[PDB]
């Protein structure tokens, strides 16, 4: 008696935001395939994060039952009762991705992580009185957006690049010119194919209303724009939290194929839903249900990022290794 086309993950503790992120990464099809190509054949099943992530993805791809993640949590060492509460998604993500990005070094799939998530920035400082400016290019794999006092994602972005004033006791150490008054701000050089945006709702938990669109145009927050690739993004996933600070239930809504057809992933339960329930209903009310992380995929990168994944895309040597574990556990 089944349906959706997708299977869920099992509830095994206060993993909190974990399950949502796992589903989010699994449907980043280009990322999934790259993981399956990792040289884990010689790794230790209970100490290898790369191998643990492969296992979950394989399970999520084949299994007809909810998937477990115990070997995964043991993998990165987050096993204490509140180990996931004292961390945020932004940190979990760096754990997994940083581990996978490094394991792919020396392979045919090396650099898949940066290609998908890394973007370029530029932080500057300009002195008011004296002529001195300092430039520093930066790399980022995600964006933390201020939400308190903002209506939509557009104002958060307006505020993000806003010029900052450095004055008396804020005065900038200009070295040879001694302390000075100056401005500091940021400007975007590039925006990645997959955009990880975390909404700064936790600092407390801010449940004010905050709107985000299905289609997001960022072309204007970029230094130089370039036709043939307007920075227009398509909403892929909405990571939702319900309740107050330490009172919760985490869920995620995704339209996996980028076709506008959404589903709700509530741990082991996966069901179809409307756009409104995934988008508008999660803007925040005047009622605590809402989104804390959004995922957008560039309109021009949608096809490649959402590449169809086949059973053959998983190395036979991996397939067998995983399949044997199923037998060992079947004989239990």
GROMACS .gro file of C-alpha atoms in nm:
model
  332
    1UNK     CA    1   0.000   0.000   0.000
    2UNK     CA    2   0.239   0.282  -0.109
    3UNK     CA    3   0.255   0.598  -0.336
    4UNK     CA    4   0.460   0.929  -0.349
    5UNK     CA    5   0.769   0.801  -0.533
    6UNK     CA    6   0.994   0.901  -0.245
    7UNK     CA    7   1.073   0.737   0.088
    8UNK     CA    8   1.145   0.900   0.423
    9UNK     CA    9   1.403   0.896   0.699
   10UNK     CA   10   1.339   0.752   1.046
   11UNK     CA   11   1.304   0.948   1.370
   12UNK     CA   12   1.585   0.838   1.601
   13UNK     CA   13   1.643   1.126   1.840
   14UNK     CA   14   1.673   1.501   1.852
   15UNK     CA   15   1.869   1.493   1.532
   16UNK     CA   16   1.659   1.811   1.485
   17UNK     CA   17   1.727   1.970   1.150
   18UNK     CA   18   1.937   1.667   1.020
   19UNK     CA   19   1.672   1.467   0.834
   20UNK     CA   20   1.559   1.778   0.642
   21UNK     CA   21   1.914   1.848   0.527
   22UNK     CA   22   1.963   1.486   0.423
   23UNK     CA   23   1.658   1.497   0.195
   24UNK     CA   24   1.770   1.841   0.070
   25UNK     CA   25   2.114   1.702  -0.028
   26UNK     CA   26   1.971   1.377  -0.175
   27UNK     CA   27   1.759   1.572  -0.426
   28UNK     CA   28   2.060   1.778  -0.530
   29UNK     CA   29   2.098   1.502  -0.787
   30UNK     CA   30   2.431   1.623  -0.924
   31UNK     CA   31   2.570   1.605  -0.570
   32UNK     CA   32   2.424   1.260  -0.508
   33UNK     CA   33   2.597   1.104  -0.809
   34UNK     CA   34   2.932   1.259  -0.717
   35UNK     CA   35   2.905   1.097  -0.372
   36UNK     CA   36   2.849   0.749  -0.523
   37UNK     CA   37   3.176   0.795  -0.713
   38UNK     CA   38   3.387   0.833  -0.397
   39UNK     CA   39   3.669   0.580  -0.329
   40UNK     CA   40   3.539   0.433  -0.003
   41UNK     CA   41   3.604   0.065  -0.094
   42UNK     CA   42   3.875   0.062   0.171
   43UNK     CA   43   3.703   0.279   0.432
   44UNK     CA   44   3.581   0.155   0.773
   45UNK     CA   45   3.197   0.130   0.764
   46UNK     CA   46   3.177   0.276   1.118
   47UNK     CA   47   3.425   0.564   1.094
   48UNK     CA   48   3.384   0.691   0.737
   49UNK     CA   49   3.146   0.987   0.692
   50UNK     CA   50   3.179   0.961   0.311
   51UNK     CA   51   3.070   0.594   0.321
   52UNK     CA   52   2.790   0.667   0.570
   53UNK     CA   53   2.645   0.933   0.341
   54UNK     CA   54   2.662   0.691   0.048
   55UNK     CA   55   2.471   0.433   0.248
   56UNK     CA   56   2.191   0.677   0.329
   57UNK     CA   57   2.167   0.794  -0.033
   58UNK     CA   58   2.159   0.436  -0.160
   59UNK     CA   59   1.891   0.354   0.093
   60UNK     CA   60   1.689   0.663   0.005
   61UNK     CA   61   1.716   0.563  -0.361
   62UNK     CA   62   1.614   0.197  -0.331
   63UNK     CA   63   1.443   0.124   0.001
   64UNK     CA   64   1.063   0.097   0.040
   65UNK     CA   65   1.100   0.165   0.413
   66UNK     CA   66   1.211   0.463   0.626
   67UNK     CA   67   1.587   0.502   0.634
   68UNK     CA   68   1.802   0.498   0.948
   69UNK     CA   69   2.106   0.716   1.020
   70UNK     CA   70   2.274   0.575   1.334
   71UNK     CA   71   2.595   0.484   1.148
   72UNK     CA   72   2.583   0.839   1.013
   73UNK     CA   73   2.565   1.017   1.351
   74UNK     CA   74   2.830   0.787   1.492
   75UNK     CA   75   3.032   0.883   1.185
   76UNK     CA   76   3.084   1.253   1.270
   77UNK     CA   77   3.053   1.202   1.645
   78UNK     CA   78   2.731   1.380   1.740
   79UNK     CA   79   2.579   1.131   1.981
   80UNK     CA   80   2.501   1.311   2.306
   81UNK     CA   81   2.136   1.372   2.396
   82UNK     CA   82   2.158   1.742   2.303
   83UNK     CA   83   2.444   1.721   2.051
   84UNK     CA   84   2.221   1.846   1.770
   85UNK     CA   85   2.055   2.116   1.976
   86UNK     CA   86   2.386   2.287   2.046
   87UNK     CA   87   2.446   2.313   1.670
   88UNK     CA   88   2.268   2.475   1.372
   89UNK     CA   89   2.215   2.345   1.015
   90UNK     CA   90   2.490   2.577   0.886
   91UNK     CA   91   2.734   2.370   1.093
   92UNK     CA   92   2.598   2.027   1.012
   93UNK     CA   93   2.621   2.112   0.643
   94UNK     CA   94   2.990   2.208   0.668
   95UNK     CA   95   3.056   1.880   0.851
   96UNK     CA   96   2.908   1.660   0.576
   97UNK     CA   97   3.009   1.865   0.274
   98UNK     CA   98   3.358   1.939   0.400
   99UNK     CA   99   3.409   1.565   0.457
  100UNK     CA  100   3.278   1.473   0.114
  101UNK     CA  101   3.463   1.754  -0.065
  102UNK     CA  102   3.795   1.633   0.075
  103UNK     CA  103   3.731   1.266  -0.002
  104UNK     CA  104   3.666   1.360  -0.365
  105UNK     CA  105   4.018   1.505  -0.399
  106UNK     CA  106   4.224   1.307  -0.647
  107UNK     CA  107   3.909   1.174  -0.816
  108UNK     CA  108   3.721   1.235  -1.140
  109UNK     CA  109   3.459   1.409  -0.932
  110UNK     CA  110   3.693   1.639  -0.734
  111UNK     CA  111   3.571   1.996  -0.683
  112UNK     CA  112   3.204   1.909  -0.725
  113UNK     CA  113   3.125   2.078  -0.395
  114UNK     CA  114   3.275   2.422  -0.487
  115UNK     CA  115   3.126   2.404  -0.838
  116UNK     CA  116   2.780   2.375  -0.682
  117UNK     CA  117   2.790   2.577  -0.358
  118UNK     CA  118   3.080   2.824  -0.359
  119UNK     CA  119   3.030   3.188  -0.456
  120UNK     CA  120   3.253   3.496  -0.465
  121UNK     CA  121   3.225   3.808  -0.250
  122UNK     CA  122   3.415   4.130  -0.185
  123UNK     CA  123   3.439   4.311   0.150
  124UNK     CA  124   3.571   4.666   0.136
  125UNK     CA  125   3.661   4.956   0.364
  126UNK     CA  126   3.681   5.320   0.255
  127UNK     CA  127   3.819   5.596   0.478
  128UNK     CA  128   3.614   5.917   0.494
  129UNK     CA  129   3.887   6.176   0.556
  130UNK     CA  130   4.205   6.000   0.442
  131UNK     CA  131   4.237   5.823   0.108
  132UNK     CA  132   4.273   5.455   0.192
  133UNK     CA  133   4.063   5.158   0.085
  134UNK     CA  134   4.113   4.790   0.165
  135UNK     CA  135   3.974   4.515  -0.057
  136UNK     CA  136   3.935   4.151   0.040
  137UNK     CA  137   3.767   3.893  -0.186
  138UNK     CA  138   3.583   3.614  -0.005
  139UNK     CA  139   3.436   3.272  -0.081
  140UNK     CA  140   3.107   3.149   0.064
  141UNK     CA  141   2.906   2.829   0.049
  142UNK     CA  142   2.592   2.985   0.197
  143UNK     CA  143   2.430   3.311   0.308
  144UNK     CA  144   2.301   3.410   0.651
  145UNK     CA  145   2.018   3.660   0.606
  146UNK     CA  146   1.889   3.902   0.872
  147UNK     CA  147   1.516   3.859   0.923
  148UNK     CA  148   1.413   4.076   1.219
  149UNK     CA  149   1.271   4.401   1.088
  150UNK     CA  150   1.251   4.279   0.727
  151UNK     CA  151   0.945   4.190   0.516
  152UNK     CA  152   1.084   3.984   0.226
  153UNK     CA  153   1.406   3.824   0.105
  154UNK     CA  154   1.463   4.139  -0.098
  155UNK     CA  155   1.502   4.365   0.206
  156UNK     CA  156   1.730   4.108   0.373
  157UNK     CA  157   1.949   4.136   0.066
  158UNK     CA  158   1.914   4.516   0.070
  159UNK     CA  159   2.032   4.518   0.430
  160UNK     CA  160   2.309   4.262   0.364
  161UNK     CA  161   2.492   4.485   0.118
  162UNK     CA  162   2.414   4.808   0.304
  163UNK     CA  163   2.710   5.036   0.386
  164UNK     CA  164   2.829   5.026   0.749
  165UNK     CA  165   2.957   5.333   0.936
  166UNK     CA  166   3.272   5.298   1.147
  167UNK     CA  167   3.303   5.596   1.392
  168UNK     CA  168   3.439   5.695   1.735
  169UNK     CA  169   3.524   5.360   1.913
  170UNK     CA  170   3.424   5.187   1.592
  171UNK     CA  171   3.695   5.385   1.411
  172UNK     CA  172   3.899   5.168   1.176
  173UNK     CA  173   4.266   5.091   1.239
  174UNK     CA  174   4.405   5.229   0.912
  175UNK     CA  175   4.759   5.143   1.015
  176UNK     CA  176   4.975   5.437   0.904
  177UNK     CA  177   4.682   5.681   0.921
  178UNK     CA  178   4.589   5.566   1.269
  179UNK     CA  179   4.225   5.521   1.372
  180UNK     CA  180   3.984   5.672   1.119
  181UNK     CA  181   3.618   5.708   1.027
  182UNK     CA  182   3.519   5.496   0.727
  183UNK     CA  183   3.249   5.276   0.573
  184UNK     CA  184   3.235   4.899   0.536
  185UNK     CA  185   3.006   4.699   0.309
  186UNK     CA  186   2.981   4.391   0.091
  187UNK     CA  187   2.925   4.330  -0.282
  188UNK     CA  188   2.846   4.003  -0.460
  189UNK     CA  189   3.083   3.884  -0.733
  190UNK     CA  190   2.911   3.552  -0.806
  191UNK     CA  191   2.611   3.347  -0.697
  192UNK     CA  192   2.636   2.962  -0.706
  193UNK     CA  193   2.414   2.714  -0.895
  194UNK     CA  194   2.270   2.593  -0.565
  195UNK     CA  195   2.190   2.872  -0.316
  196UNK     CA  196   2.181   2.785   0.051
  197UNK     CA  197   2.010   3.070   0.235
  198UNK     CA  198   1.966   3.045   0.613
  199UNK     CA  199   1.709   3.273   0.767
  200UNK     CA  200   1.842   3.422   1.092
  201UNK     CA  201   1.535   3.331   1.298
  202UNK     CA  202   1.739   3.185   1.584
  203UNK     CA  203   1.951   3.416   1.803
  204UNK     CA  204   1.554   3.301   2.067
  205UNK     CA  205   1.331   3.217   1.772
  206UNK     CA  206   1.182   3.502   1.574
  207UNK     CA  207   0.839   3.413   1.433
  208UNK     CA  208   0.760   3.738   1.254
  209UNK     CA  209   0.623   3.722   0.902
  210UNK     CA  210   0.887   3.691   0.628
  211UNK     CA  211   0.810   3.638   0.260
  212UNK     CA  212   1.021   3.452   0.005
  213UNK     CA  213   0.933   3.393  -0.360
  214UNK     CA  214   0.908   3.094  -0.594
  215UNK     CA  215   1.112   3.292  -0.843
  216UNK     CA  216   1.391   3.508  -0.703
  217UNK     CA  217   1.587   3.762  -0.915
  218UNK     CA  218   1.924   3.850  -0.765
  219UNK     CA  219   2.081   4.004  -1.078
  220UNK     CA  220   2.078   4.347  -0.917
  221UNK     CA  221   2.289   4.267  -0.609
  222UNK     CA  222   2.577   4.167  -0.835
  223UNK     CA  223   2.863   4.394  -0.939
  224UNK     CA  224   2.860   4.315  -1.309
  225UNK     CA  225   2.561   4.134  -1.458
  226UNK     CA  226   2.599   3.925  -1.768
  227UNK     CA  227   2.315   3.848  -2.008
  228UNK     CA  228   2.307   3.482  -2.111
  229UNK     CA  229   2.276   3.403  -1.742
  230UNK     CA  230   2.056   3.644  -1.547
  231UNK     CA  231   2.084   3.560  -1.175
  232UNK     CA  232   1.726   3.431  -1.155
  233UNK     CA  233   1.672   3.154  -0.899
  234UNK     CA  234   1.404   2.884  -0.865
  235UNK     CA  235   1.277   2.773  -0.524
  236UNK     CA  236   1.375   2.411  -0.461
  237UNK     CA  237   1.339   2.345  -0.083
  238UNK     CA  238   1.190   2.502   0.230
  239UNK     CA  239   1.326   2.381   0.566
  240UNK     CA  240   1.055   2.443   0.825
  241UNK     CA  241   1.051   2.456   1.206
  242UNK     CA  242   0.741   2.467   1.423
  243UNK     CA  243   0.715   2.617   1.771
  244UNK     CA  244   0.956   2.813   1.987
  245UNK     CA  245   1.334   2.808   2.046
  246UNK     CA  246   1.373   2.470   2.219
  247UNK     CA  247   1.027   2.342   2.134
  248UNK     CA  248   1.012   2.175   1.798
  249UNK     CA  249   0.931   1.964   1.503
  250UNK     CA  250   1.138   1.995   1.189
  251UNK     CA  251   1.005   1.927   0.841
  252UNK     CA  252   1.100   2.009   0.481
  253UNK     CA  253   0.903   2.070   0.160
  254UNK     CA  254   1.059   2.008  -0.179
  255UNK     CA  255   0.959   1.997  -0.547
  256UNK     CA  256   1.245   1.750  -0.630
  257UNK     CA  257   1.223   1.777  -1.007
  258UNK     CA  258   1.201   2.158  -1.017
  259UNK     CA  259   0.865   2.112  -1.191
  260UNK     CA  260   0.662   2.299  -0.931
  261UNK     CA  261   0.513   1.976  -0.792
  262UNK     CA  262   0.573   1.964  -0.414
  263UNK     CA  263   0.584   1.709  -0.132
  264UNK     CA  264   0.609   1.725   0.246
  265UNK     CA  265   0.880   1.521   0.416
  266UNK     CA  266   0.794   1.466   0.781
  267UNK     CA  267   1.049   1.204   0.887
  268UNK     CA  268   0.913   0.860   0.787
  269UNK     CA  269   0.599   1.015   0.633
  270UNK     CA  270   0.609   1.155   0.277
  271UNK     CA  271   0.300   1.303   0.109
  272UNK     CA  272   0.193   1.530  -0.178
  273UNK     CA  273   0.097   1.893  -0.113
  274UNK     CA  274   0.007   2.225  -0.280
  275UNK     CA  275   0.242   2.516  -0.357
  276UNK     CA  276   0.061   2.728  -0.098
  277UNK     CA  277   0.134   2.481   0.184
  278UNK     CA  278   0.502   2.479   0.089
  279UNK     CA  279   0.541   2.850   0.025
  280UNK     CA  280   0.276   3.100   0.146
  281UNK     CA  281   0.176   2.890   0.448
  282UNK     CA  282   0.537   2.907   0.571
  283UNK     CA  283   0.584   3.286   0.558
  284UNK     CA  284   0.499   3.322   0.925
  285UNK     CA  285   0.167   3.427   1.071
  286UNK     CA  286  -0.006   3.631   1.338
  287UNK     CA  287   0.122   3.143   1.451
  288UNK     CA  288   0.468   2.982   1.486
  289UNK     CA  289   0.503   2.760   1.173
  290UNK     CA  290   0.775   2.884   0.938
  291UNK     CA  291   1.097   2.845   0.732
  292UNK     CA  292   1.456   2.883   0.862
  293UNK     CA  293   1.652   2.777   0.551
  294UNK     CA  294   1.575   2.808   0.180
  295UNK     CA  295   1.732   2.643  -0.121
  296UNK     CA  296   1.725   2.801  -0.466
  297UNK     CA  297   1.872   2.661  -0.786
  298UNK     CA  298   1.980   2.888  -1.072
  299UNK     CA  299   1.736   2.877  -1.362
  300UNK     CA  300   2.024   2.807  -1.605
  301UNK     CA  301   2.166   2.527  -1.391
  302UNK     CA  302   1.839   2.351  -1.310
  303UNK     CA  303   1.874   2.073  -1.571
  304UNK     CA  304   2.224   1.966  -1.477
  305UNK     CA  305   2.170   1.999  -1.100
  306UNK     CA  306   1.853   1.793  -1.126
  307UNK     CA  307   2.010   1.527  -1.354
  308UNK     CA  308   1.809   1.205  -1.361
  309UNK     CA  309   1.982   0.946  -1.139
  310UNK     CA  310   1.974   0.579  -1.244
  311UNK     CA  311   2.044   0.263  -1.047
  312UNK     CA  312   2.345   0.214  -1.273
  313UNK     CA  313   2.494   0.541  -1.149
  314UNK     CA  314   2.600   0.350  -0.836
  315UNK     CA  315   2.933   0.158  -0.873
  316UNK     CA  316   2.874  -0.217  -0.863
  317UNK     CA  317   3.145  -0.243  -0.599
  318UNK     CA  318   2.945  -0.006  -0.378
  319UNK     CA  319   2.614  -0.176  -0.458
  320UNK     CA  320   2.747  -0.511  -0.345
  321UNK     CA  321   2.908  -0.378  -0.028
  322UNK     CA  322   2.586  -0.211   0.083
  323UNK     CA  323   2.376  -0.510  -0.024
  324UNK     CA  324   2.586  -0.742   0.196
  325UNK     CA  325   2.517  -0.531   0.502
  326UNK     CA  326   2.146  -0.584   0.433
  327UNK     CA  327   2.201  -0.961   0.443
  328UNK     CA  328   2.407  -0.944   0.762
  329UNK     CA  329   2.134  -0.739   0.923
  330UNK     CA  330   1.861  -0.958   0.769
  331UNK     CA  331   2.025  -1.253   0.945
  332UNK     CA  332   1.946  -1.080   1.280
   0.00000   0.00000   0.00000
